[PDB]
Amino acid sequence: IQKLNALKPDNRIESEGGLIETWNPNNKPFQCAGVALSRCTLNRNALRRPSYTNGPQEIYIQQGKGIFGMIYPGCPSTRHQKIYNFREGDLIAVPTGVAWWMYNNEDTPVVAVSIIDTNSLENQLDQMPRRFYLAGNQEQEFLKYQQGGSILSGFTLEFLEHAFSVDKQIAKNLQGEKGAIVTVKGGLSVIKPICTMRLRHNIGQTSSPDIYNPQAGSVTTATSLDFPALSWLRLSAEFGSLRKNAMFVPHYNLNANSIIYALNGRALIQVVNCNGERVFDGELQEGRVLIVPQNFVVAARSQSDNFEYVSFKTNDTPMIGTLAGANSLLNALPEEVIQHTFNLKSQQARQIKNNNPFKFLVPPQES
Amino acid sequence: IQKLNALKPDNRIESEGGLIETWNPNNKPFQCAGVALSRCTLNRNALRRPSYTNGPQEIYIQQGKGIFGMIYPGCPSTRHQKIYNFREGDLIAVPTGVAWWMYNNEDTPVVAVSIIDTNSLENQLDQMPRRFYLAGNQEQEFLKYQQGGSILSGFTLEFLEHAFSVDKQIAKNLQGEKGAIVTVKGGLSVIKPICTMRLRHNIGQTSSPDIYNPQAGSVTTATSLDFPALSWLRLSAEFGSLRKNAMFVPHYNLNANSIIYALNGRALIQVVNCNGERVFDGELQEGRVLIVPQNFVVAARSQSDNFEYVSFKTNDTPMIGTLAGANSLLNALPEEVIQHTFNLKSQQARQIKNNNPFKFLVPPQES
Amino acid sequence: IQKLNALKPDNRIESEGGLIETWNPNNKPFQCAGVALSRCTLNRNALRRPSYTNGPQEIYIQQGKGIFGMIYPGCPSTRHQKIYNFREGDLIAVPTGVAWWMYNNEDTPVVAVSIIDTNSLENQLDQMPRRFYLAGNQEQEFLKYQQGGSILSGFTLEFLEHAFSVDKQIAKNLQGEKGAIVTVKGGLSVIKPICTMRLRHNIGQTSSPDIYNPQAGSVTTATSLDFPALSWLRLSAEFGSLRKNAMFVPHYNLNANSIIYALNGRALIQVVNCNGERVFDGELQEGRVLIVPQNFVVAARSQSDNFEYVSFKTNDTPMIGTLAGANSLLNALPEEVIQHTFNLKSQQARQIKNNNPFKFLVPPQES
Structure with missing residues (x-):
């Protein structure tokens, strides 16, 4: 595609x-x-x-x-x-x-x-x-x-x-x-x-978010671990509420296909593929859907005070690979492989692994 | 089809x-x-x-x-x-x-x-x-x-x-x-x-049947529960022997395909699909086979004294939804929703639930 | 093919x-x-x-x-x-x-x-x-x-x-x-x-082999029994070292495809299909890859001192069915039935069952 x-x-x-x-x-x-x-x-x-x-x-x-x-x-x-x-x-x-x-x-x-x-x-x-x-x-x-x-x-x-x-x-x-x-x-x-x-x-109307950031939003996921009838289905779901101009970091699903349906407001999404092409670069609004294939990477920045969405992932234990923030894959890299695959100084590499303390939901830039 | x-x-x-x-x-x-x-x-x-x-x-x-x-x-x-x-x-x-x-x-x-x-x-x-x-x-x-x-x-x-x-x-x-x-x-x-x-x-015939009814015939099922080597295969089979003019009620297989090979006699079978279309309305006699796809509904009336069949289901533990009989899907509906989906009255909805007291085989109509 | x-x-x-x-x-x-x-x-x-x-x-x-x-x-x-x-x-x-x-x-x-x-x-x-x-x-x-x-x-x-x-x-x-x-x-x-x-x-050769014949060679294989992470991959592999003019017998994988990569040397492989057609006859030499489908049968004679190969199977627990050997299918066939399928005398059946005593690897023919 x-x-x-x-x-x-x-x-x-x-x-x-x-x-x-x-x-x-x-x-x-x-x-x-x-x-x-x-x-x-x-x-x-x-x-x-x-x-x-x-x-x-x-x-x-x-x-x-x-x-x-x-x-x-x-x-x-x-x-x-x-x-x-x-x-x-x-x-x-x-x-x-x-x-x-x-x-x-x-x-x-x-x-x-x-x-x-x-x-x-x-x-x-x-x-x-x-x-x-x-x-x-x-x-x-x-x-x-x-x-x-x-x-x-x-x-x-x-x-x-x-x-x-x-x-x-x-x-x-x-x-x-x-x-x-x-x-x-x-x-x-x-x-x-x-x-x-x-x-x-x-x-949706829970109060126990997987991730919750008072400055950026909150996200919840129903997997089989907590909703075991889903092992029968081999299907999953995610609900996320996002403040205006907050963001969910670049990520990919290792084992699943996301169908992101937007429940409220709007956000500017970007999804890039295996060849680095930017296969969608626009906004997703209420009552509209975007499919993000398996290892493709999506990143969203919100446009509404609370851009809500249900993302139906096709796997009852989906796995996401965060590419920026607290638990990213670049954090889990040695500080010197990053220096040579990115062509970064030792000084810089550290910032790319520690400037964002936040897991998944990253707060609004403030300008 | x-x-x-x-x-x-x-x-x-x-x-x-x-x-x-x-x-x-x-x-x-x-x-x-x-x-x-x-x-x-x-x-x-x-x-x-x-x-x-x-x-x-x-x-x-x-x-x-x-x-x-x-x-x-x-x-x-x-x-x-x-x-x-x-x-x-x-x-x-x-x-x-x-x-x-x-x-x-x-x-x-x-x-x-x-x-x-x-x-x-x-x-x-x-x-x-x-x-x-x-x-x-x-x-x-x-x-x-x-x-x-x-x-x-x-x-x-x-x-x-x-x-x-x-x-x-x-x-x-x-x-x-x-x-x-x-x-x-x-x-x-x-x-x-x-x-x-x-x-x-x-x-086969020298068994202890699962459904047995001396006025209508009998059914016998080998799922993987009872014959454990079948979970290696992921295949099932079923044997039936219906009395002349006895019927197996309309039912579908939730999770399997069936290959009905008729072993003895003849029967008037009827299968309908998702659009209410009668895809087969005829007779299956000896040495002939009829394929009933996945959620297609099947019903047969026996025309022989003892119409016998083998039903190769493609799932090591198949579930069938019965549409009429002691344990039917309609039997488990609220009497009031049975009125509103089928346009009946309370009394008639007391009847679709209770006129047939039998499980899977219904006896000859007896005229 | x-x-x-x-x-x-x-x-x-x-x-x-x-x-x-x-x-x-x-x-x-x-x-x-x-x-x-x-x-x-x-x-x-x-x-x-x-x-x-x-x-x-x-x-x-x-x-x-x-x-x-x-x-x-x-x-x-x-x-x-x-x-x-x-x-x-x-x-x-x-x-x-x-x-x-x-x-x-x-x-x-x-x-x-x-x-x-x-x-x-x-x-x-x-x-x-x-x-x-x-x-x-x-x-x-x-x-x-x-x-x-x-x-x-x-x-x-x-x-x-x-x-x-x-x-x-x-x-x-x-x-x-x-x-x-x-x-x-x-x-x-x-x-x-x-x-x-x-x-x-x-x-590799450093490993303790599964088969080791001092005149023929050795075979090491990693299934998910001994390398459990491979049950995740649902894949396995198999290394093989064979002396000049030795042979790994005709055999077939029950449940897996085979990708033979020729590490060192050159052998002469024969694979025959379900019809009887020898769909390959000739030599797999170094840095070349021979695909050998699921129930297709393969035999190979090493033409170098120690032909080395990796076989990527597509199953973490592949079962092989060898056609000649200690462990062969013919061995488990009663002497009488093996007389009748191959049209042999009793005493010619014992020769098939007993002449070759080695598992998978048979030495050079001794010329």
């Missing part, structure tokens, strides 16, 4: 109580990353209908409070299986093929941006995304990219009558006859709170 | 003591599937000569009894390494690159239908199925599909001469100069009985 | 303090094996500047003595992380992404040959070899195949300024303002003795 561009969605699907936005998974960034991105927003009383995908999915909630519930095959009911609550900041984990449903109850919408790792090992189909809905007669979000009905409507009435042991009339209602997101007139009176596994860990 | 079809073979190879038939790997079903199917039948006194593929193999024995022996490199002998017996319903696990031979001695022929997963992490070559014979001049079963002799008959007359430490004459014998299934005139007088790992497990 | 051949390199770069050669990764043999070979060389007082790749690397030192550093991300300093010394006959293991530098102080020019497994599961990018130089203005070894400056020079002056917290005078030095391998004029004052695990193991 010669030029990474900030990408917008190219597909909106307005449902009765919501909206689904999907990004084109065949632009070379998304081809390379091997994920498909989606932003679902569901209004008051909306109930996203039960569905599943042929790959690992990890959902980040940008705003809202609802209930969500996953129908796991080998699992015990309570009537019905476990319903979890959520808040903005929560990272939801969805194992391959597991069917889920989500519902909102307040005025403030649920906006939940999320990625499908189409390129996962668990995805024994092809690199195309697919959602398999259990209900309704509607085009699945990604059918456009391939080139409607639920997985139950593609059956024969005689087959559905026999399977459920119900009469023809009710069997007709299963068989199709509002989109994926439906509005509940009366609102669900369904109780507000591996089958044992926690699949909800908050990296 | 546009349309799935009940595939038969496109390759008969008749040898002295038996027959090998293979199914085309370049068909779109097998290409998605990632498998290579084949069915070898050995007659009385026949010896399938030692060979090996570059991927995980899983052999099911449709009928007959005989013996088979692995030639595992890191092992102790006795004279010779271990030879095992086999009955019908035996599932033999063969690790990547291990060699083996199989012999029959009855009048009843061994019919062993098997799959090589050519899309394995273990297969480090290409998607093309191939078999490497130690002995005998003959072309390999999948030479047909690429576009001969065995591996030993390719070296120089003096390289075997030098290697085995023998003369020109028996070097010419080892050097090639009846195909893969030769008949052993008198009979192999070898006694009828990881190195220690049990590569045999009976899933 | 139709035919194989002994390959010499196509690309060579003269750097100030040494040289770098790279084999073309887009040959059909290299696309099949899935690896990229480079042979670098450090003359005296040379530093190889910090670099890193999107894949698991395994460097084998052919000749010389020197030291090297590995800049691991999480790892603790000492002033800087822990340095290791290498001497010839060594194998150094470099995890995906880890940056490393390499120095030479003797006159004796360090020659190391190495692979990058671009087909790894850690390699999330594509099938391209690509080195990320941490400093200096030079075009990367592999760029040519793709068709410069470092990851630091592509960045902006003020981004580098603010990043490192420096003055603009040393930020411009730092911004790249003598190639990969640069001569330290005085030569480093730096000493000569997962953050603590061993990443060096010696498989």
Whole structure:
């Protein structure tokens, strides 16, 4: 790739109580990353209908409070299986093929941006995304990219009558006859709170930052160490809040692919490749995404009082190699290999290893 | 997949003591599937000569009894390494690159239908199925599909001469100069009985079933839980025997592809995809196979008194989501969300949950 | 593959303090094996500047003595992380992404040959070899195949300024303002003795060999049982020394590709495929590389006094299946079945089983 561009969605699907936005998974960034991105927003009383995908999915909630519930095959009911609550900041984990449903109850919408790792090992189909809905007669979000009905409507009435042991009339209602997101007139009176596994860990409205710098921002990461349902996914996530003109240092992921989606405000990012080319040099704003491939190096300087972002890294234990600051790779170098690979005096080399005391987040220059 | 079809073979190879038939790997079903199917039948006194593929193999024995022996490199002998017996319903696990031979001695022929997963992490070559014979001049079963002799008959007359430490004459014998299934005139007088790992497990008719229902039939599953050599393969198999007009309810496999080879009888099968499209609506009869991709939904009604099948799943521990039955996905949903995704009333949603009290097999409708 | 051949390199770069050669990764043999070979060389007082790749690397030192550093991300300093010394006959293991530098102080020019497994599961990018130089203005070894400056020079002056917290005078030095391998004029004052695990193991002649035949030679191999860091790499290596006219028997790797680099001398190798076609017959001589795929079979007779080779296998625990020897597959086959596959008398079967008593190495034929 010669030029990474900030990408917008190219597909909106307005449902009765919501909206689904999907990004084109065949632009070379998304081809390379091997994920498909989606932003679902569901209004008051909306109930996203039960569905599943042929790959690992990890959902980040940008705003809202609802209930969500996953129908796991080998699992015990309570009537019905476990319903979890959520808040903005929560990272939801969805194992391959597991069917889920989500519902909102307040005025403030649920906006939940999320990625499908189409390129996962668990995805024994092809690199195309697919959602398999259990209900309704509607085009699945990604059918456009391939080139409607639920997985139950593609059956024969005689087959559905026999399977459920119900009469023809009710069997007709299963068989199709509002989109994926439906509005509940009366609102669900369904109780507000591996089958044992926690699949909800908050990296937004926390107060326990991985890194926290009162002069520059704060950053948090959910890896499997602290959110073990993520070893199932082999997926990760980072949330970082950045003050105006603070910066996160040049770094690269050794073992992963970052899909940086910007939640708030804006920042000027720079990403340079193996040949030293500056494959993107611009600004990333709200509701826009930048994919940063594996060993490529990104550096950002903020433009807003708090430029927030969720970076979905594809690896449940991602590793970053900081190139400037407290724990950098140049710090860990002998003071004389730096002198000869950079062509620096002994005096200077020291400054390049100690002028910035800060780990990852470096404060605003002050001018 | 546009349309799935009940595939038969496109390759008969008749040898002295038996027959090998293979199914085309370049068909779109097998290409998605990632498998290579084949069915070898050995007659009385026949010896399938030692060979090996570059991927995980899983052999099911449709009928007959005989013996088979692995030639595992890191092992102790006795004279010779271990030879095992086999009955019908035996599932033999063969690790990547291990060699083996199989012999029959009855009048009843061994019919062993098997799959090589050519899309394995273990297969480090290409998607093309191939078999490497130690002995005998003959072309390999999948030479047909690429576009001969065995591996030993390719070296120089003096390289075997030098290697085995023998003369020109028996070097010419080892050097090639009846195909893969030769008949052993008198009979192999070898006694009828990881190195220690049990590569045999009976899933067939002489088993203790997983689902059993005397009005509808029974299912039996060999995951890696119960047959531990299968976690080496990363392959599974399943046996079913449905009563006439009994059905297995619509279900999908969360994490595996299935290759349903029908062993006995006939059945009316139906599979639907992500867009509610009925990709197969027909009959799978004996000696035919139907590939059901990853999150595709499958349901079948039996048309025989006892329709029997083998289902090679491609995952050593497959999970199936049942869409109807005691433990269905719909059974674990809140009654109220079942009303709102399918447009039912409370009463009807009491029925989709409770009209069928059965797990996986549902009895004949009984009219 | 139709035919194989002994390959010499196509690309060579003269750097100030040494040289770098790279084999073309887009040959059909290299696309099949899935690896990229480079042979670098450090003359005296040379530093190889910090670099890193999107894949698991395994460097084998052919000749010389020197030291090297590995800049691991999480790892603790000492002033800087822990340095290791290498001497010839060594194998150094470099995890995906880890940056490393390499120095030479003797006159004796360090020659190391190495692979990058671009087909790894850690390699999330594509099938391209690509080195990320941490400093200096030079075009990367592999760029040519793709068709410069470092990851630091592509960045902006003020981004580098603010990043490192420096003055603009040393930020411009730092911004790249003598190639990969640069001569330290005085030569480093730096000493000569997962953050603590061993990443060096010696498989040269100094080592205790696995096989030692005083008339034939010796074979030493490092798996992840004896060099555990290689389980990270999912790679291994194997050194071989063979007297004139001796032979390593016909054999096949069950689970790995093989990259034979001819260190010293010249032998005559034969590799035959699954059809019986001798896809290579002729001589692999010094500084040349023969790729030998997964279940393909190889035999070789040494034509020099002591032909020396390193075999880069693509598996940390490769299993080999030898075709003639003490330990052979034929040995484990009952005398009777080996009579019938090869068409031999009983007494001619015992000759195959017993004449050659040596494991892997068979002496000269004695003429």
